[PDB]
Structures are given as structure tokens and as C-alpha cells.
Write a protein that binds this ligand. Structure first.
Ligand SMILES: *C[C@@]1(O)CCC(=O)[C@@H](OC)[C@]1(O)[C@@]1(C)O[C@@H]1CC=C(C)C
Ligand SMILES: [Co+2]
Ligand SMILES: [Co+2]
Length: 355
């Protein structure tokens, strides 16, 4: 129909012909039109996922407020995402857990069960959540703040992300994208509680190509100079994300781990330990090679699984992705879109009227 006040209509029911809205189409910085059209079912699946992401995030921006717990925020977001993507096993669903990393933490925090963290007025929270249709994944992310003191830090990172998006293209060197992002990001100076800083890109965080059911398909997009001159290629899909910091501009692993994901290259492994076998079966049926978090095991009724999960990590079947944080007292921000390198044009598929 039309979407409801608090969104509840699946995107696929809003577009009855099954043709979903294009994102922003850009010229790059005959046969190729036939090539583009031959993969139209794929582009269309990304667009369906991107429209779910646009409607979910608009809803989130309407209610996210200090005083909510991080668990309340993530469950209310994920509820809406499951409804609008019309969750259906591995055919449609959430691509990876809801990041809501706070303050000096830049990526890969979501709360586990029991976490009592409450969002504060002075917090800077990176909302990074993903949707997919048939494994075509949108990774798109924005920063939430309530104090206007962070406004220039947010503007720096947004401008750096849009610069990486504009520089991207077929035959562009990945190192050139990183150099461009850094030059824009470092042109910003900010003042927060009487201290001034030049914004720095977080050098050991990266954008990344995306493959089917594969959030990180192996090519990395640097956000500082000095990276690889490997080129982007026609048909590739990238998460162009940047992270800026008032700290060292370097993240380390910190806090409890919540995010896990099966190693894409690992195939069948016979396991006889009962609890570890069961948990591997649960992961294979519900997530495949998509990332998941502990809250998502809890909701499937799993319990007593932490030792099984460690076993799978120690076997190398699953990998842990702990929160990634700069130094204590620093502030980090993130903006991100997914882009499609179509034969005829570059589509910023997750672009919205918001960012
Ligand atoms: C989670 C992540 O996107 C943060 C930013 C990165 O640097 C990026 O790696 C290029 C990530 O680390 C990513 C894609 O590798 C992880 C895999 C994804 C999940 C959600 C655990
Ligand atoms: Co992301
Ligand atoms: Co990403």
C-alpha cells in the first residue's frame, strides 16, 4: 500500500511489480548497456535492500534518544528491519548485527544480553546496520549525536565519505580513493570542550568490496594514503565508509565480543562434540556466511553456547570480531554507503534524502 506511520509494510508489498527504486546514479569520473541489463535482477535485489535500509533508518532517527538502553535501541531497529525486509531465512534478512558503537569505539559493538549501557546526551553513536535480499547486502551507516559540539566532526566524516564515493569508479586505483578521503577529512579542524583537533582518518579501518553472502569480499578501500594500487573493476560492489577520530587515528580490540562470522573459505567440518555440532548447525541454517551476534543466538532459544562458540572460533570455523576502539576520551564518527559499479554508471544504491 502506502507505508504506515511506524513502518510495518514490507518493501516488496510497496512495489507490486517487483521493481525497486534506483539509488543516485552518477557518471564515472551499446554492449555495456546490454551487460548492465543482463544483471538487472541483481541490481534490483540491492535496491530492495537499500529501500528497507532508508525506511528503517528514517524511523530510527525519529525516536533514538538518550535514556534508552543500547539493547532497546538495537531490538527496536532490528524489529523494523525484519518487518520491512520481510525476513525469510537466508533469502531475505539482516545482513549483520546492528553496530551502535559509542564514543572512542568506532565499529563492531552491539550489546550482548545483560548489557546495561544507556545512551547519553554527550554520546556519539555509530549506527551501522545491514539488510540483504538473496545475499545482495547493503552496508550503510551514519552517526547519531545530540550535542551540537560534534557537528563539524560529523561534517568532516560525511564530506570524506562523499569524496570517496565520488572518486570511486571502474579502473580507479584504491590507493587514490584513500588519498582523496584523507585529504578532505584532514582539511577539517574541530573544537570540542575547549580543545581543538585536526580530524584524522582511522588508518586501520577500511571500506571493502562486497560479494554474495560475503560482507568482505577481499578488496579493501583505504581511508589514508599509502595503500594498494589495485584497481576497482566493472561489476564490483563496495562499501565506501570512512571513520574520523580525535584520538590516535588507530583502533584496537576492546571490551566483550558480540560479533562473529563463519570463515567464508571453510567448508564442511565433521564435529562430534554435541553442543559444538548443534551450534554449528544453528549457525549454518540461520546465518550461513553472514555475520551474527550473541543476542541473535539468544533469540533462537540457544543457551549454554559460549563454550561451543569459543570452540568454533578456536577451530577457525568461526571468527570473532570484537569492538574496535581508539584511545579513551577520543571521539570517532562514521558515514557509509554501498555503491554498485554498473557497466553504464556508478549507483550510490543506498543514498537517501537524509545522507
Ligand atoms: C565491520 C567492518 O566493516 C568495520 C570497518 C572495516 O574495517 C571492515 O573491514 C574492512 C569491517 O571490519 C569488516 C567488513 O570486516 C568486518 C567483517 C564484518 C562484520 C560485520 C563482522
Ligand atoms: Co557497515
Ligand atoms: Co562496512
Amino acid at each position: 500500500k502506502v507505508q504506515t506511520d511506524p513502518p510495518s509494510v514490507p518493501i516488496c508489498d510497496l512495489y507490486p511489480n517487483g521493481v525497486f527504486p534506483k539509488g543516485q546514479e552518477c557518471e564515472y569520473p551499446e554492449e555495456k548497456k546490454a551487460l548492465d541489463q543482463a544483471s538487472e535482477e541483481i541490481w534490483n535485489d540491492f535496491r530492495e535492500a537499500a529501500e528497507a535500509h532508508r525506511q528503517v533508518r528514517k524511523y530510527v532517527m525519529s525516536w533514538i534518544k538518550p535514556g534508552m538502553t543500547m539493547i532497546e535501541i538495537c531490538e527496536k531497529l532490528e524489529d523494523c528491519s525484519r518487518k520491512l525486509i520481510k525476513e525469510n531465512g537466508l533469502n531475505a534478512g539482516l545482513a549483520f548485527p546492528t553496530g551502535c558503537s559509542l564514543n572512542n569505539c568506532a565499529a563492531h559493538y552491539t550489546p550482548n544480553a545483560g548489557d546495561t549501557t544507556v545512551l547519553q546526551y554527550d554520546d556519539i553513536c555509530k549506527i551501522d546496520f545491514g539488510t540483504h535480499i538473496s545475499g545482495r547486502i547493503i552496508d550503510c551507516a551514519f552517526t547519531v549525536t545530540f550535542n551540537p559540539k560534534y557537528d563539524t566532526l560529523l561534517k568532516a566524516v560525511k564530506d570524506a565519505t562523499n569524496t570517496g564515493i565520488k572518486c570511486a569508479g571502474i579502473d580507479v586505483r584504491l590507493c587514490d580513493v584513500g588519498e582523496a578521503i584523507q585529504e578532505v577529512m584532514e582539511s577539517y579542524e574541530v573544537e570540542i570542550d575547549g580543545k581543538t583537533y585536526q580530524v584524522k582518518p582511522i588508518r586501520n579501518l577500511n571500506g571493502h568490496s562486497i560479494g554474495q553472502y560475503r560482507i568482505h569480499a577481499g578488496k579493501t578501500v583505504p581511508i589514508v594514503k599509502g595503500g594498494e594500487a589495485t584497481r576497482m573493476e566493472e561489476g564490483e560492489v563496495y562499501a565506501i565508509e570512512t571513520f574520523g577520530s580525535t584520538g590516535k587515528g588507530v583502533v584496537h580490540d576492546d571490551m566483550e565480543c558480540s560479533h562473529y562470522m563463519k570463515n567464508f573459505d571453510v567448508g564442511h567440518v565433521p564435529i562430534r562434540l554435541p553442543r559444538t555440532k548443534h551450534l554449528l548447525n544453528v549457525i549454518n541454517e540461520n546465518f550461513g556466511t553472514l555475520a551474527f551476534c550473541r543476542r541473535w543466538l539468544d533469540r533462537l532459544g540457544e543457551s549454554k553456547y559460549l563454550m561451543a562458540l569459543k570452540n568454533l572460533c578456536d577451530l577457525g570455523i568461526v571468527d570473532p570480531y570484537p569492538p574496535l576502539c581508539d584511545i579513551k576520551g577520543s571521539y570517532t564518527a562514521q558515514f557509509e554507503h554501498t555503491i554498485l559499479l554498473r557497466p553504464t554508471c556508478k549507483e550510490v544504491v543506498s543514498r537517501g534524502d537524509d545522507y
